[model samples]
Target: TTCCPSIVARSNFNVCRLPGTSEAICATYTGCIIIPGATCPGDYAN
Candidate 1:
């Protein structure tokens, strides 16, 4: 099962390329912690 957090991945996502070429696009959150090599994509302005 695939679940998305209460907070939607992002209000915006960047266009990137991954392993496949048939679909040939990834509109994923550039600030998402879910991405490999991405850590501490944080929030809470106080």
Candidate 2:
């Protein structure tokens, strides 16, 4: 089962932690971070 909305390609994305516990994040095919409720360009799946 998938933990978040969709299963994305791990290497296609990166993670950034500021302070508190971090939530799962999505990113663009170009390795750009995609925030919650946002869409990305190119092929992205993790």
Candidate 3:
């Protein structure tokens, strides 16, 4: 399996913490993290 060594590679997962709190995240081709409280930010790129 391929291991993602970068935070930008895999979608950011929401955790019960401050650093990740209120953070805008994105995911690849997987269900990274999502729920009522922790919603996934729509797809983004530049």
Candidate 4:
């Protein structure tokens, strides 16, 4: 479990990363956070 900063107020959300990728998503209702990462999809490619 890692601590990730949230976009909502001063709250921090627990985020999960995709396998083999640095992509992170917010956690689901089933105890899985799936918050978007710095290099999420749809954004400019580095």
Top lDDT hit: 2
TM-score of each: 0.18, 0.20, 0.19, 0.18
lDDT by residue (tens digit), candidate 3, 1-46 = 1223245544333232236543234323322443445334454220
Question: Which tens-of-lDDT digit does each residue in 3-26 have in candidate 2?
Answer: 222343443333332343233433
Q: lDDT tens digits, residues 1-46, model 1?
A: 1112323433322223244422212223333334334333335111
Candidate 1, position 29, lDDT: 34
Candidate 4 Cα misplacement greater than 4 A, ranges: 1-6, 9-12, 15-26, 30-38, 42-46
Q: How would you encode candidate 4's per-residue C-alpha lDDT over 1-46 as one tens digit per residue?
A: 3222334311222222334333233333222333345433322211
Model 4 TM-score is: 0.18
* Local distance difference test scores for all models: 0.29, 0.35, 0.35, 0.30
Residue-level lDDT for 14 in candidate 3 = 28
What's the count of clashing pairs in each model shown? 0, 5, 0, 9
Ranking by lDDT, best first? 2, 3, 4, 1
Ranking by TM-score: 2, 3, 4, 1
RMSD for all candidates, in order, please. Answer: 8.7, 7.8, 10.5, 9.6
lDDT of 4 at 18: 30
Q: What lDDT score is found at residue 43 in candidate 4?
A: 22
